[PDB]
């Protein structure tokens, strides 16, 4: 029993929007359905976000804290046991139905 964090390079050299999303991923659908979240991280060339990224990188090589974060995380995993309410039940049903109605919406994504 464990959690898996995985990183995968795109098929070939870089992501190609001409091919579908499933053809840029080297995973068969049975494996690809299990992951709760797949993040498509795309590299743009827009300076409106590149310059801000550049400042964040460049401000770090001249000359909550982790203890609070781990204390926060270790507390939540130990004491917090949420229970899904009746009202929140309907939203899960409708979200999956709408996602399924666009026809790769396996039921593994519903438990996700």
């Amino acid at each position: 029993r464990s959690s898996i964090l995985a990183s995968a390079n795109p098929i070939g050299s870089r992501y190609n929007p001409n091919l579908p999303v499933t053809e840029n991923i080297d995973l068969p659908p049975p494996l690809l359905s299990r992951f709760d979240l797949v993040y498509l991280v795309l590299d743009k060339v827009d300076e409106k976000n590149d310059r801000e990224l550049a400042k964040h990188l460049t401000n770090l090589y001249l000359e909550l804290p982790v203890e609070f974060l781990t204390m926060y995380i270790s507390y939540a995993k130990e004491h917090i046991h949420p229970i899904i309410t009746e009202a929140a039940k309907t939203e899960l049903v409708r979200a999956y139905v709408g996602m399924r109605k666009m026809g790769t919406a396996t039921t593994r994504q519903l438990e996700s």
């Binding site: 050299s13 590299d43 990224l53 550049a54 990188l57």
Partner: protein, 105 residues
């Protein structure tokens, strides 16, 4: 364009940083300036080079003004001022205007 070496990534940015740090550190310098940052940028540009082995000066100002205001008049007040400020003598400008008067302008 089928002309690059495979684009430039954020790794190129840190490439500039490390080269600049390395170049300055070789000269025992404790600080890095443009004289080495440009040199770092030079190396990431020279490497690709092996693959690849006054009437106009006056008229350009007129064309720029024809974009800024676009008035197709025959008398001019902005052109004479700017050309004079550029260091020309009005005899050169008079010859320039005379030529373009014949040259379909």
């Amino acid at each position: 364009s089928k002309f690059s070496f495979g684009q430039a990534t954020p790794r190129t940015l840190l490439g500039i940083i490390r080269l600049s740090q390395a170049l300055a550190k070789l000269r025992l310098a404790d600080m890095v300036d443009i004289d080495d940052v440009e040199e770092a940028l030079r190396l990431v540009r020279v490497s690709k080079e092996s693959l690849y082995q006054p009437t106009t000066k006056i008229f350009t100002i007129i064309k720029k003004m024809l974009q800024e205001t676009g008035k197709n008049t025959l008398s001019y007040e902005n052109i004479v001022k700017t050309v004079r400020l550029r260091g020309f003598t009005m005899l050169q400008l008079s010859n320039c205007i005379q030529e373009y008067s014949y040259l379909n302008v």
